[PDB]
PDB file of C-alpha atoms and ligand atoms in Angstrom:
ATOM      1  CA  UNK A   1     -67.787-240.251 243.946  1.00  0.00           C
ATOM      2  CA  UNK A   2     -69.854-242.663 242.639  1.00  0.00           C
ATOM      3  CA  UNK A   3     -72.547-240.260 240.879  1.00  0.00           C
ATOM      4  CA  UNK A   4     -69.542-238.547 239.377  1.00  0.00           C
ATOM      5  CA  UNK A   5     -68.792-241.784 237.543  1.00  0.00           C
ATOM      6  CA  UNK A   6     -72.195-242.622 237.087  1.00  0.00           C
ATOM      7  CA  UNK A   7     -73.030-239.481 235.014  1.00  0.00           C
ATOM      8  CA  UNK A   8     -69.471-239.588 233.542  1.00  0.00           C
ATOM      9  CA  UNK A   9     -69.951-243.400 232.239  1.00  0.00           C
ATOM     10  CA  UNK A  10     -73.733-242.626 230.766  1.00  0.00           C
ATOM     11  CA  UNK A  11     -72.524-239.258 229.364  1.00  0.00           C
ATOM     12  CA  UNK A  12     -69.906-240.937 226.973  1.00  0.00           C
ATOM     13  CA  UNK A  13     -72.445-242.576 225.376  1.00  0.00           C
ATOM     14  CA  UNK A  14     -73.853-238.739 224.220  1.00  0.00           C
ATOM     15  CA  UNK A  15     -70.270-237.366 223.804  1.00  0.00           C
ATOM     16  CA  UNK A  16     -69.945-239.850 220.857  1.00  0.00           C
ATOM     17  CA  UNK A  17     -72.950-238.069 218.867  1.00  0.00           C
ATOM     18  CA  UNK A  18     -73.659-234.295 219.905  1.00  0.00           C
ATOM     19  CA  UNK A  19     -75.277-233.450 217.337  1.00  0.00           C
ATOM     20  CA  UNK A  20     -78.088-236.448 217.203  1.00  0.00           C
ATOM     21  CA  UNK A  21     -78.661-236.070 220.507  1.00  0.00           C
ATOM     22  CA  UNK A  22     -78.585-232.927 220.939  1.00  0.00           C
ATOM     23  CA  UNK A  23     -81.203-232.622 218.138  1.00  0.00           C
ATOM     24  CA  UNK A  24     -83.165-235.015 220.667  1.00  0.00           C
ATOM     25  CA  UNK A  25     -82.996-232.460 223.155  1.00  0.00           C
ATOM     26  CA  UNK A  26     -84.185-229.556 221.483  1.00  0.00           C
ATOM     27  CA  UNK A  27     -86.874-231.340 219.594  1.00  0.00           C
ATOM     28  CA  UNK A  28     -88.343-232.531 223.076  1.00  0.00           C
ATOM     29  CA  UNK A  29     -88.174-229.002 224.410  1.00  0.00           C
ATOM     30  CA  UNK A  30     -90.228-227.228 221.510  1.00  0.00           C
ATOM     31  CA  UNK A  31     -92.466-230.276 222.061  1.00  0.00           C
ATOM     32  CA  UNK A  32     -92.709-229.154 225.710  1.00  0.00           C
ATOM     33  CA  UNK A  33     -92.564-225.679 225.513  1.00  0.00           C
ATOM     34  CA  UNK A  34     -92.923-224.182 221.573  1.00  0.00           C
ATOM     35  CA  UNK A  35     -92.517-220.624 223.006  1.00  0.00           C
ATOM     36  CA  UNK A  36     -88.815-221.252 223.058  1.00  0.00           C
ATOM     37  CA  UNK A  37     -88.559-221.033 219.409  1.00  0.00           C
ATOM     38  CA  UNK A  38     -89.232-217.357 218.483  1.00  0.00           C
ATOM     39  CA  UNK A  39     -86.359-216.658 220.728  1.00  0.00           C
ATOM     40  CA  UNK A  40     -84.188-217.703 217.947  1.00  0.00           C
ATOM     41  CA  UNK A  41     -83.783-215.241 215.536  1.00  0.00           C
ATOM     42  CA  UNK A  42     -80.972-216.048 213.134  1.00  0.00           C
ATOM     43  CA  UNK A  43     -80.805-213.595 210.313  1.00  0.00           C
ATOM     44  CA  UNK A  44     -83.832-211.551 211.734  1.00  0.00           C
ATOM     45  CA  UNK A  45     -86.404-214.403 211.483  1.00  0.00           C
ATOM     46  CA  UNK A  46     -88.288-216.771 213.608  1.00  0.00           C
ATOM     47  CA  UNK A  47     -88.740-220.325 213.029  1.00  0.00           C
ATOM     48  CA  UNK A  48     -92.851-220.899 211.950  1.00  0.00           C
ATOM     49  CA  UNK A  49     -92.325-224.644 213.101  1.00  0.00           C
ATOM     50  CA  UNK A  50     -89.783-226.830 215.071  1.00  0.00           C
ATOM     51  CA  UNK A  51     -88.848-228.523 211.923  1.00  0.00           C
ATOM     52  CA  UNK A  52     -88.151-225.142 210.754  1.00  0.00           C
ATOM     53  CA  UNK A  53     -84.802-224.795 213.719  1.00  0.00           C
ATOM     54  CA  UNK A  54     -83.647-228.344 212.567  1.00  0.00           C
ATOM     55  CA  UNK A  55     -82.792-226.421 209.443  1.00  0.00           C
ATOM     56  CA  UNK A  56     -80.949-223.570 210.214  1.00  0.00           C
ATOM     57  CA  UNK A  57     -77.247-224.240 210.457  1.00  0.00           C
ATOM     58  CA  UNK A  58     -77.311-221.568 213.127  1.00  0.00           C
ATOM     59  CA  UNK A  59     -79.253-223.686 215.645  1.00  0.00           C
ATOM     60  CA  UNK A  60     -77.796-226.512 214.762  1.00  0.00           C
ATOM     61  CA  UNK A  61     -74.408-224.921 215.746  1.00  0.00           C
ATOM     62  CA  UNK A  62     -76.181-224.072 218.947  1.00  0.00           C
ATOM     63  CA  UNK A  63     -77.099-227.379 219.548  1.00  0.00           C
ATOM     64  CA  UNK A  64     -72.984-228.085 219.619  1.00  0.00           C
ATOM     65  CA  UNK A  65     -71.925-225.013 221.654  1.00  0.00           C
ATOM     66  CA  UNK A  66     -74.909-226.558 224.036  1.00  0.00           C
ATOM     67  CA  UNK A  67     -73.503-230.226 224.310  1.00  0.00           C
ATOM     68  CA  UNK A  68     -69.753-228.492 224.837  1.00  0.00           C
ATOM     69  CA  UNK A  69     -71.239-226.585 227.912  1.00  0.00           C
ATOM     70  CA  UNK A  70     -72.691-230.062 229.027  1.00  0.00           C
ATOM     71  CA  UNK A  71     -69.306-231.652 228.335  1.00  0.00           C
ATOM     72  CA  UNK A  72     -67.794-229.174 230.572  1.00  0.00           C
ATOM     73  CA  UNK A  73     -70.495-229.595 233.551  1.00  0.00           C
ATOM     74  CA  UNK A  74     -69.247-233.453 233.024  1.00  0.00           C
ATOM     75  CA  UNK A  75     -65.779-232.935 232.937  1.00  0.00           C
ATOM     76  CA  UNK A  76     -66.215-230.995 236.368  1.00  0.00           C
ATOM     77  CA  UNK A  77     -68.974-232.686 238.075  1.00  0.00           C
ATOM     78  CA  UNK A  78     -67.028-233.565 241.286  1.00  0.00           C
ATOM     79  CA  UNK A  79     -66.137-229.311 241.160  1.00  0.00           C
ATOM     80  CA  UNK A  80     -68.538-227.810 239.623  1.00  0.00           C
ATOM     81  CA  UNK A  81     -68.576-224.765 241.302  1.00  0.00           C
ATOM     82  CA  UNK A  82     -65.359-223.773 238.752  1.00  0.00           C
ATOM     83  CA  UNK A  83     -67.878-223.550 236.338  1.00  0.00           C
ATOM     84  CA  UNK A  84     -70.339-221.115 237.869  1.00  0.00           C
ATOM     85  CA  UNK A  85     -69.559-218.124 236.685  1.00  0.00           C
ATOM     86  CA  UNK A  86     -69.097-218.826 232.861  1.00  0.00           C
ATOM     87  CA  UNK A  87     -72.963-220.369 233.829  1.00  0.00           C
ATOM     88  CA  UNK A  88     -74.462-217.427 235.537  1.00  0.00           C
ATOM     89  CA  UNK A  89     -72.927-215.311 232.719  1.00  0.00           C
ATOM     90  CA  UNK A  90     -74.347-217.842 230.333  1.00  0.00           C
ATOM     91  CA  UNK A  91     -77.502-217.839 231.939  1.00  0.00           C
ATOM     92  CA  UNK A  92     -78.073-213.615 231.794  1.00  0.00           C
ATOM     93  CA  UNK A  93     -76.864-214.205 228.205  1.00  0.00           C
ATOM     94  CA  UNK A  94     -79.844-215.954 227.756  1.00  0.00           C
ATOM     95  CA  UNK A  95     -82.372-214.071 229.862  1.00  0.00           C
ATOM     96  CA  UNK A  96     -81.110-211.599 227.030  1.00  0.00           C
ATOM     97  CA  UNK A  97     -82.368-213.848 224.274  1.00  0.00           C
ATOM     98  CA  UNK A  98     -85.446-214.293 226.396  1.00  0.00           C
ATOM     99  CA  UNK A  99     -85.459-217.808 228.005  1.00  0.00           C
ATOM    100  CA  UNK A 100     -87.375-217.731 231.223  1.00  0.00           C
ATOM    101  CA  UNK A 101     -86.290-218.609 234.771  1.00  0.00           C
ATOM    102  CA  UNK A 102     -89.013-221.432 234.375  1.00  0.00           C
ATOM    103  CA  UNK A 103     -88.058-222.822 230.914  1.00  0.00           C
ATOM    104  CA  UNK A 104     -84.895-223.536 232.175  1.00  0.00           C
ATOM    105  CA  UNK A 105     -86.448-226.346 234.447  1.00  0.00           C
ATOM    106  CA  UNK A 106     -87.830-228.202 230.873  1.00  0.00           C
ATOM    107  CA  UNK A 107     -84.498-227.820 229.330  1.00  0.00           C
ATOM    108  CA  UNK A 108     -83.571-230.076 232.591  1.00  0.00           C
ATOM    109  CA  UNK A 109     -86.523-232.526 231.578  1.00  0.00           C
ATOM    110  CA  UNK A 110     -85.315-232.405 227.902  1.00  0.00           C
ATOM    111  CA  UNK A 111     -81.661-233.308 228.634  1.00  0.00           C
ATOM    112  CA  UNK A 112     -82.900-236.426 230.973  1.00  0.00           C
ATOM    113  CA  UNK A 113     -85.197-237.298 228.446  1.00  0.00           C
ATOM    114  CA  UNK A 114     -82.487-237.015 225.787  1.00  0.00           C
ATOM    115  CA  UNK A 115     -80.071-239.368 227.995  1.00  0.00           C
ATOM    116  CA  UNK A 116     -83.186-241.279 228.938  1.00  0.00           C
ATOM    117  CA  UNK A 117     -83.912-242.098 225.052  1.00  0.00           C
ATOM    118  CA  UNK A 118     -79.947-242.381 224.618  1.00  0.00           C
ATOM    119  CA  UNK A 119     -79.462-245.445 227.281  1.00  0.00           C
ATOM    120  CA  UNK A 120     -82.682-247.480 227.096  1.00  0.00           C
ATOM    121  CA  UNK A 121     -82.087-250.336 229.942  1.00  0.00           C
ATOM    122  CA  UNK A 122     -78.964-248.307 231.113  1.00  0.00           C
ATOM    123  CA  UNK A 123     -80.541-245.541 232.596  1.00  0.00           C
ATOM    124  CA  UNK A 124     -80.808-246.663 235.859  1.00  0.00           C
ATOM    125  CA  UNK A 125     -82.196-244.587 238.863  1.00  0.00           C
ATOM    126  CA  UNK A 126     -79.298-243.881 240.193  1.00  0.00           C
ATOM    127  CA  UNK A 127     -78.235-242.253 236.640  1.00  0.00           C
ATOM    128  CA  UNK A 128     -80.989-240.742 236.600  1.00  0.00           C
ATOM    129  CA  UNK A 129     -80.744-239.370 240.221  1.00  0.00           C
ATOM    130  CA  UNK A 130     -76.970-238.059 239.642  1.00  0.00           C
ATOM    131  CA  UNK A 131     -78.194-236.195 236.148  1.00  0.00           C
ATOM    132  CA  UNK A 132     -80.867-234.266 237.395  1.00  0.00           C
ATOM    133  CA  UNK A 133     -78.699-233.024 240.329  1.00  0.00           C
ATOM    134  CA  UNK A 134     -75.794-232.231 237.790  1.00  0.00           C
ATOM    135  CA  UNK A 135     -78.234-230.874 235.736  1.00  0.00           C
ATOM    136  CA  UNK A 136     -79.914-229.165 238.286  1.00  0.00           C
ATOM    137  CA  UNK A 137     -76.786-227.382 239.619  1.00  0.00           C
ATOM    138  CA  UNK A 138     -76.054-225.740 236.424  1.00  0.00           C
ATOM    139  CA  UNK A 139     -79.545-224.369 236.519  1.00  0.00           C
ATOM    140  CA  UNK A 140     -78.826-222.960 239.719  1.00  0.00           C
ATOM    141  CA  UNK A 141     -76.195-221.156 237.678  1.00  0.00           C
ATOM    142  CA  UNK A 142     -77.687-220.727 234.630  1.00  0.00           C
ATOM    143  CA  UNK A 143     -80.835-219.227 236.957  1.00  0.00           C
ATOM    144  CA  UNK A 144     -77.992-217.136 238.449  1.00  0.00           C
ATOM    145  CA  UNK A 145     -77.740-214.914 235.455  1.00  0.00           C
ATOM    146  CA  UNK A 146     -81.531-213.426 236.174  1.00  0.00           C
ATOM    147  CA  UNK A 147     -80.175-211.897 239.469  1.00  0.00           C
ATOM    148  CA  UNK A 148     -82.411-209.663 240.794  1.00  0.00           C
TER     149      UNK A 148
HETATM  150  C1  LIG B 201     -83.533-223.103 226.800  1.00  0.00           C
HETATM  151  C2  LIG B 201     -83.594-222.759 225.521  1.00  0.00           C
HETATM  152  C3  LIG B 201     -82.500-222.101 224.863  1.00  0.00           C
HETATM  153  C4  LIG B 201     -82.677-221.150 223.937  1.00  0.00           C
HETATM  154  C5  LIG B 201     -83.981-220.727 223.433  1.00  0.00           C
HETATM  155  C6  LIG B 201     -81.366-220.682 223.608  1.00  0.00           C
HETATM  156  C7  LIG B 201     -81.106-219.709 222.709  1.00  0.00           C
HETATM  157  C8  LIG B 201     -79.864-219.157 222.463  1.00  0.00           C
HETATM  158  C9  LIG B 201     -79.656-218.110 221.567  1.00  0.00           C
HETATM  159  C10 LIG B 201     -80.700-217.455 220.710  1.00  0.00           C
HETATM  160  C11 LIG B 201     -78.326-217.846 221.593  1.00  0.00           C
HETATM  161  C12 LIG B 201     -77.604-216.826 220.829  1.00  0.00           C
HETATM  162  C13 LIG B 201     -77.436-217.253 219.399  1.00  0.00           C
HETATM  163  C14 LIG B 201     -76.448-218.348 219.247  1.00  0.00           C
HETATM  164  O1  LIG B 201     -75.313-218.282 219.721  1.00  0.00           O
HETATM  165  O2  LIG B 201     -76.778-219.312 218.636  1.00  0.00           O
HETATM  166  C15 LIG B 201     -77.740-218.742 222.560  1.00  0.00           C
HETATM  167  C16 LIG B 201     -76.376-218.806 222.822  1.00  0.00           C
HETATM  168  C17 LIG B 201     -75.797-219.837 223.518  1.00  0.00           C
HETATM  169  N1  LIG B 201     -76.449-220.870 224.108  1.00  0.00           N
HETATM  170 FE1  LIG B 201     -78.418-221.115 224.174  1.00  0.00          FE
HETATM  171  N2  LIG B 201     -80.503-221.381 224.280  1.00  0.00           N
HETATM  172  C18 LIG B 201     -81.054-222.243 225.091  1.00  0.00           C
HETATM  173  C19 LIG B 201     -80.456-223.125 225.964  1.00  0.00           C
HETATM  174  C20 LIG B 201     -79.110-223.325 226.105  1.00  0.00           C
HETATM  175  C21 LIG B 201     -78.579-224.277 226.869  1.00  0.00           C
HETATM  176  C22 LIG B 201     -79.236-225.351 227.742  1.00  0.00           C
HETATM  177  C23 LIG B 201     -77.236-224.098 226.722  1.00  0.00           C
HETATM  178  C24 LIG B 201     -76.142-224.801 227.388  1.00  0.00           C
HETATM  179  C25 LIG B 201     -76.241-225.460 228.484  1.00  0.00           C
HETATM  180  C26 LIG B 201     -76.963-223.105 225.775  1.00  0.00           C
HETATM  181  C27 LIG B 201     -75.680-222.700 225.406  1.00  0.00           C
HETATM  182  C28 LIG B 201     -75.505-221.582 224.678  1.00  0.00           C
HETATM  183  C29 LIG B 201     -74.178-220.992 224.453  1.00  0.00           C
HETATM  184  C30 LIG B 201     -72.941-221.629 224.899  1.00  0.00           C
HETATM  185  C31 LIG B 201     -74.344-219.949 223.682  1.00  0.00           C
HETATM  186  C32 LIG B 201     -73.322-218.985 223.192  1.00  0.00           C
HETATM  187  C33 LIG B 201     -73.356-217.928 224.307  1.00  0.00           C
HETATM  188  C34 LIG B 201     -72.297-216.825 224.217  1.00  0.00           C
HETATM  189  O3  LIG B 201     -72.456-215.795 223.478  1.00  0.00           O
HETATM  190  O4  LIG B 201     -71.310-216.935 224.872  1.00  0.00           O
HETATM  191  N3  LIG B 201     -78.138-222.636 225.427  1.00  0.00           N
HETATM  192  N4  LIG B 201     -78.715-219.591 222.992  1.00  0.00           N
END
């Protein structure tokens, strides 16, 4: 598939520096939705601020496990469907933590706009195109995890 390459070719560009961009990511998503940060509550406390999370070597080891569950949506983006259930698990995991159904839509817009920022001229349409629908199947099975 052509997608499949496409997302494969712009995601190695990512790979190379999880953490960075990854830091992107997150930093974009309190920007679009600062609710999300309470819900991290390493050692009992919240985070006041955003800048606050970049501190904590506890989110920033969450910002690794999250790039490793991109890495595997990447890895099987032709069958991705051998991935759902870790994802639906994953995804009540964090309806546990407290993410919303809806806040998993901006972690969608976060991780384009973190590949967006990433390949400057390279992110073409197309890449764009194949990344939300990657993307937006593991939402469908992160989503999964809120079922009923
Ligand atoms: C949307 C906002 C998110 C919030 C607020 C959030 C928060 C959390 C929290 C508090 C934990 C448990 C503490 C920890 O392990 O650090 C957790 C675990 C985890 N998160 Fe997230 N998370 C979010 C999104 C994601 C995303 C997008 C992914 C991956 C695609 C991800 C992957 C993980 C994984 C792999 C774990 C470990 C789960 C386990 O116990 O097996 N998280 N997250």
């Amino acid at each position: 598939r052509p997608e499949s390459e496409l997302i494969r070719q712009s995601w190695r560009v990512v790979s190379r520096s999880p953490l960075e961009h990854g830091t992107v990511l997150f930093a974009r998503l309190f920007a679009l939705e600062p609710s999300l940060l309470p819900l991290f509550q390493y050692n009992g406390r919240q985070f006041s601020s955003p800048e606050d999370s970049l501190s904590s070597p506890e989110f920033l080891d969450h910002i690794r496990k999250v790039m490793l569950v991109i890495d595997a949506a990447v890895t099987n983006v032709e069958d991705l469907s051998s991935l759902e259930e870790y994802l639906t698990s994953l995804g009540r995991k964090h309806r546990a933590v407290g993410v919303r159904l809806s806040s998993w839509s901006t972690v969608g817009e976060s991780l384009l706009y973190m590949l967006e920022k990433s390949l400057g001229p390279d992110f073409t349409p197309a890449t764009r195109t194949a990344w939300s629908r990657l993307y937006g199947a593991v939402v469908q099975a992160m989503s999964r995890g809120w079922d009923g």
